[PDB]
Amino acid sequence: SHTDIKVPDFSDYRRPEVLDSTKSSKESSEARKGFSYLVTATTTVGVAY
Amino acid sequence: AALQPQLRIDKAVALQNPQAHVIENLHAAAYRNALANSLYCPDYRIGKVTPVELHDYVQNHFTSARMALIGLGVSHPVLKQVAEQFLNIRGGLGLSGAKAKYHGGEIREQNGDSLVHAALVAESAAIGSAEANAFSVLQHVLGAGPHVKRG
Amino acid sequence: PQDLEFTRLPNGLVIASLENYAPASRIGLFIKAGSRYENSNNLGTSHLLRLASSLTTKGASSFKITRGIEAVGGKLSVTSTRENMAYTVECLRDDVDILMEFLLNVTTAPEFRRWEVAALQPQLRIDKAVALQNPQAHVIENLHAAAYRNALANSLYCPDYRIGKVTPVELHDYVQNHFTSARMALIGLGVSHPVLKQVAEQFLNIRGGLGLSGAKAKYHGGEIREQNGDSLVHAALVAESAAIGSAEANAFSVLQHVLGAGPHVKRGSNATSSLYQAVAKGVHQPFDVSAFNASYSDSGLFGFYTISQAASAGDVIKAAYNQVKTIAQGNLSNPDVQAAKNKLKAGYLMSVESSEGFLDEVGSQALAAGSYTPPSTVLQQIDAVADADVINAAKKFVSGRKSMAASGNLGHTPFIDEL
Amino acid sequence: GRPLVASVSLNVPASVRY
Amino acid sequence: TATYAQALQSVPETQVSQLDNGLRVASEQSSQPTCTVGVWIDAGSRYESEKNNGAGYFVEHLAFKGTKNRPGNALEKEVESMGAHLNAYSTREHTAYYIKALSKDLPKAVELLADIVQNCSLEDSQIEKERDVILQELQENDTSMRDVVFNYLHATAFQGTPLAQSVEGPSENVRKLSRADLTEYLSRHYKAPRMVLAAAGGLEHRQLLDLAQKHFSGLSGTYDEDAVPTLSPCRFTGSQICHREDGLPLAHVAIAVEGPGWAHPDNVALQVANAIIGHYDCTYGGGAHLSSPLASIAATNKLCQSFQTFNICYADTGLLGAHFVCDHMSIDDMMFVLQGQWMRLCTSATESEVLRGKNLLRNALVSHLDGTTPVCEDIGRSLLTYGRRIPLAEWESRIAEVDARVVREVCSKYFYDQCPAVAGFGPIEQLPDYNRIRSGMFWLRF
Amino acid sequence: QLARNWVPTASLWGAVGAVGLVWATDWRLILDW
Amino acid sequence: MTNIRKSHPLMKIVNNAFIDLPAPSNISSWWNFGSLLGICLILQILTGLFLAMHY
Numbered sequence A: 001s002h003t004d005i006k007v008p009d010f011s012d013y014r015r016p017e018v019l020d021s022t023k024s025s026k027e028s029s030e031a032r033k034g035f036s037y038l039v040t041a042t043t044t045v046g047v048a049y
Numbered sequence B: 001a002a003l004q005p006q007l008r009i010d011k012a013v014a015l016q017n018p019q020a021h022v023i024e025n026l027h028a029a030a031y032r033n034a035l036a037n038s039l040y041c042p043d044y045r046i047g048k049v050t051p052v053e054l055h056d057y058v059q060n061h062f063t064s065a066r067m068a069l070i071g072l073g074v075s076h077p078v079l080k081q082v083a084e085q086f087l088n089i090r091g092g093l094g095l096s097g098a099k100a101k102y103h104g105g106e107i108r109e110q111n112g113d114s115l116v117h118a119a120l121v122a123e124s125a126a127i128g129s130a131e132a133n134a135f136s137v138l139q140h141v142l143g144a145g146p147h148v149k150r151g
Numbered sequence C: 001p002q003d004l005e006f007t008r009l010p011n012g013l014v015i016a017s018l019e020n021y022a023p024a025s026r027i028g029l030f031i032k033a034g035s036r037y038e039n040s041n042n043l044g045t046s047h048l049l050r051l052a053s054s055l056t057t058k059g060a061s062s063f064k065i066t067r068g069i070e071a072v073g074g075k076l077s078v079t080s081t082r083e084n085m086a087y088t089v090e091c092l093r094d095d096v097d098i099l100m101e102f103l104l105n106v107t108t109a110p111e112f113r114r115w116e117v118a119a120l121q122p123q124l125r126i127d128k129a130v131a132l133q134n135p136q137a138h139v140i141e142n143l144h145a146a147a148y149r150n151a152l153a154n155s156l157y158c159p160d161y162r163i164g165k166v167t168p169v170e171l172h173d174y175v176q177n178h179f180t181s182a183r184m185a186l187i188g189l190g191v192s193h194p195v196l197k198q199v200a201e202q203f204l205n206i207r208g209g210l211g212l213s214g215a216k217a218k219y220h221g222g223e224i225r226e227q228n229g230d231s232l233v234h235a236a237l238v239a240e241s242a243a244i245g246s247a248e249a250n251a252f253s254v255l256q257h258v259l260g261a262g263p264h265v266k267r268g269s270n271a272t273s274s275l276y277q278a279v280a281k282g283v284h285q286p287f288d289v290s291a292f293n294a295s296y297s298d299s300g301l302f303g304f305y306t307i308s309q310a311a312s313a314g315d316v317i318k319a320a321y322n323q324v325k326t327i328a329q330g331n332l333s334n335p336d337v338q339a340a341k342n343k344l345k346a347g348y349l350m351s352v353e354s355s356e357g358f359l360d361e362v363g364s365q366a367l368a369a370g371s372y373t374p375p376s377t378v379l380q381q382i383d384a385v386a387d388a389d390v391i392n393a394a395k396k397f398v399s400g401r402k403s404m405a406a407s408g409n410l411g412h413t414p415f416i417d418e419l
Numbered sequence D: 001g002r003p004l005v006a007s008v009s010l011n012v013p014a015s016v017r018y
Numbered sequence E: 001t002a003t004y005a006q007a008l009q010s011v012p013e014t015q016v017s018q019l020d021n022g023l024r025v026a027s028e029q030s031s032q033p034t035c036t037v038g039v040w041i042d043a044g045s046r047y048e049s050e051k052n053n054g055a056g057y058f059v060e061h062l063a064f065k066g067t068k069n070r071p072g073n074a075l076e077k078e079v080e081s082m083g084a085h086l087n088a089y090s091t092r093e094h095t096a097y098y099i100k101a102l103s104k105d106l107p108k109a110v111e112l113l114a115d116i117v118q119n120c121s122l123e124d125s126q127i128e129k130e131r132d133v134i135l136q137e138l139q140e141n142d143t144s145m146r147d148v149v150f151n152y153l154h155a156t157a158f159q160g161t162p163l164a165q166s167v168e169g170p171s172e173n174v175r176k177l178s179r180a181d182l183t184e185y186l187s188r189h190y191k192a193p194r195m196v197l198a199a200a201g202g203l204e205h206r207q208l209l210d211l212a213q214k215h216f217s218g219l220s221g222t223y224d225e226d227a228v229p230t231l232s233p234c235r236f237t238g239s240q241i242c243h244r245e246d247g248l249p250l251a252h253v254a255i256a257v258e259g260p261g262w263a264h265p266d267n268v269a270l271q272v273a274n275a276i277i278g279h280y281d282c283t284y285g286g287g288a289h290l291s292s293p294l295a296s297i298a299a300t301n302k303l304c305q306s307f308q309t310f311n312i313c314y315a316d317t318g319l320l321g322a323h324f325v326c327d328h329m330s331i332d333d334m335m336f337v338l339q340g341q342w343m344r345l346c347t348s349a350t351e352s353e354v355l356r357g358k359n360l361l362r363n364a365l366v367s368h369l370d371g372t373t374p375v376c377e378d379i380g381r382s383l384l385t386y387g388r389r390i391p392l393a394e395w396e397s398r399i400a401e402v403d404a405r406v407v408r409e410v411c412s413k414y415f416y417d418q419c420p421a422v423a424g425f426g427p428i429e430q431l432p433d434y435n436r437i438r439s440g441m442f443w444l445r446f
Numbered sequence F: 001q002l003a004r005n006w007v008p009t010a011s012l013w014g015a016v017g018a019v020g021l022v023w024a025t026d027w028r029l030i031l032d033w
Numbered sequence G: 001m002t003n004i005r006k007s008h009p010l011m012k013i014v015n016n017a018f019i020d021l022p023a024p025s026n027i028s029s030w031w032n033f034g035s036l037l038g039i040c041l042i043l044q045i046l047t048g049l050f051l052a053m054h055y
């Protein structure tokens, strides 16, 4: 019945730091997000000047 | 489907006179199979009416054996013409399986209203009998409709 | 540690206590005022009364209570039945006294403020609704209505036309009438007797008055049938058993475990139960059958509550019902008797072990007897059940007037004349 | 069967039984 | 007498034993005429393969259907002979057979319970009787909105690990499953050290350990390899899923964030937080005066019919989050007022409010230990979990750890600025788009 | 109620204004590099 | 809407004509000229002003 649902693979879109199934996300997590914000905060520098 | 909600509006204004609502319980106490059926649609049954149910009950219990057409002010032949044409269908007829099987029982109900109603009934005989005539004699002896206003 | 010490007062209110080792310390208070004491114009009161425990006391604001209890981390409960309402309260080893302080004020010092009553009205429907999702509920409450006239037939819930009809006076009168120091029982568990013994005599001594017992319940015939859209009929078939506190009241409990099937093995269809098996042979796919027995002060009922589909409903009853006749015909097996009694001992002892479960059965004797009976005595009373007694008792069920209730699609349902 | 039944109002949880 | 600290001190302590092949024993004595005897195996779903998926729950039925020495429904008639109830249940990480019975009949008890664990009559007569019952249960289990919506939640967060799958597995496997795999699955996971025996009641220890002894000393229950231990950490996928169905009256939601495993210090701190936020339901006698800031608000306007917070901790992993029902026009207003709570904890929490959380935990922890079985049931999982430790009085000692700076250092980790896992079941429609939620986890100081 | 946090935070925002406020006009000053 | 700051001055509920205004999913860049008119309009009035002071 309902349980027949199963999630498709998004691997193409990911970035390989999280690619592995057997790893704790929490190791890459710290830096993984640390990049994204660096984009944002950088942007605001330009607007500021 | 658009007509569904109409029933409640219809059912409500009917039972304002409990002298109605007493009766429909009564038949439910005095029978088993057939006559105990309501003249109104029970509530859980509301959204349950499919067109098929209608469209079947149409043709089953409508038939040219079971129907009677009565004019009043109109000439016989004109009336006599059209009826034979359209109203002739089958056959089939008449599904009499209801003997109603009078059978004991009673029903009691507790509401807040301050005026009790009561009915007490035993089985009389069928229509078309001197008894069915006799009971009609018996009521007018006891049975009181007002013959004089406020009297 | 020490065993049960129960102490009458001059007032007549029983008290009893134990001293435990656990940080668990719980108190309970039982009262004789149940559903059977609501009167005609008095209906629906108890079912309101049971929701009002959080309202404003005489001395303490309703706010200070609810924040107060939780700060401690306590828990307050309420429970009713057709007979005995019980305010149960439980907390840690240490803090009981502050909490023992509130327990009185609720039942001792009520105040019903008309503006604090009216706000609670809509709550009933919300309460009533979630109760009847299991029709196995809704079948029963009809049943009592069929099998009596005056008292026991009363609902545990408030009928609908009666909702806006609850005046504070009605409450405030039913408070003092059926609450009295003769009819109440206070039971501690983990707390020393004297501390418990002190405060109770002080606050809980009032009158006198009123136990008014006028309910003999007058078992009387009847039946009730109901037509709903649901596709699964329910059915109950009952004859009058005898009152609590009798070898018969013991005998019926023997009789059920012979036929009466609770699942003893998960998903296992119970083969030891003659009833469910005696049916399944000659019948078809899902259904369920169980014996049903409950006993009250002045009387108790015995029967079996069944579930089937619309077609099988006719046979299921007749099949199971005649099966009882077989037993009434003298057919018996002493091992089953010996087997059943074992189940009973099992069913009872495992029921008691849990503190709460234990706690209830304590006072259950109290308001009834006023003594305590050690489980050993129960056991020795169990095996006293005679074989022919069981048979003869079951010969009363078949031989006497019966009643019925059914809710669902009734098209094939038999009546009590066909049985 | 049933107890027959019961009800539990109280405060922190809530339920019904049988 | 008993004082709160003193009441901890007198309790029958844990007993422990070994057998040679790796089976374990343990027990306690309550001075009680009744006893629970049971078995707790760690063989879960997260071990099972993609073909074996669901076999576990499948096996779970057959055991009581008759066995090697005692064929079909000869077994049960002995259990019903004793009048002892009999039970079994499954879980993703565990499987449990246990019995409640009088202390007297224990000699048969184990020797019965023994047989069922390993020798099992496997007859395809039973299988087709079974393969229907499951294909009966699957389609029905749609009827309960709760149990479903969780099966969304795991699959959406954990996708790509053996933990991400249903207990019972997809329907198609139920059809194709042959007793070959079972016997293989039987053979693999039921050896000791995996297995654990426990009990509590009138039993003490010795009188058990002799009648622990001989099968199973035993039928082995072996120790070889089966590699080691098929287990491996799992990934956390911040994601969303919506089953949007506009027929149904009400709309469930579940939101969750990943958390630590069984043995870990932070496991206690978070136990307390989810006591503080508290929980509300339609039917309480609380009213509008309750303390729990979500039990005051959502009771006022009935913003949500009911909600509870759950906490689940797996071997290396755990889930934190709530589960709430509310009408569709209302769903937004829960989500905001929810994230109010988590975020006011991780900064603005307070010493006083801690207590009412701290107390309740002491309350529930203790009251959880009433009764034979709830004690025994605990002992079973504990051994597999923390090892032998049953640190009862130590719990209290571990609680007084909790301080203001304890909480706000703990919850700062797992809550503030994370990636939630949302799973919902229609009429979800108003539930905000994802990038709102992520933008609602971290205060900008508003 | 003896506010615990928000003593650290405000102290940053106090700089955030003033530092920024120095950066908007910024007449006289000390360091250059 | 419990302590949602969007009610309290009413004027902000008028300002939920923007933020939650639902929109289609697929929208070509060609619909950006909705805004870019406005901003080209504002940028006038200011720059349109500081000319006036010396004209």
Ligand code: HEM
Binding pocket: G041, G044, G045, G046, G048, G049, G050, G051, G052, G055
């Ligand atoms: C839709 C808004 C506007 C449009 C399309 C517009 C357009 C123009 C144009 C085409 C010119 C002549 C350009 C030139 O001579 O170099 C002009 C000049 C001028 N506009 Fe506007 N203008 C707008 C708004 C305003 C506003 C709001 C003001 C005053 C606050 C303003 C004040 C002036 C003045 C004083 C001039 C003469 C200065 C000059 O032309 O060098 N304009 N405007």
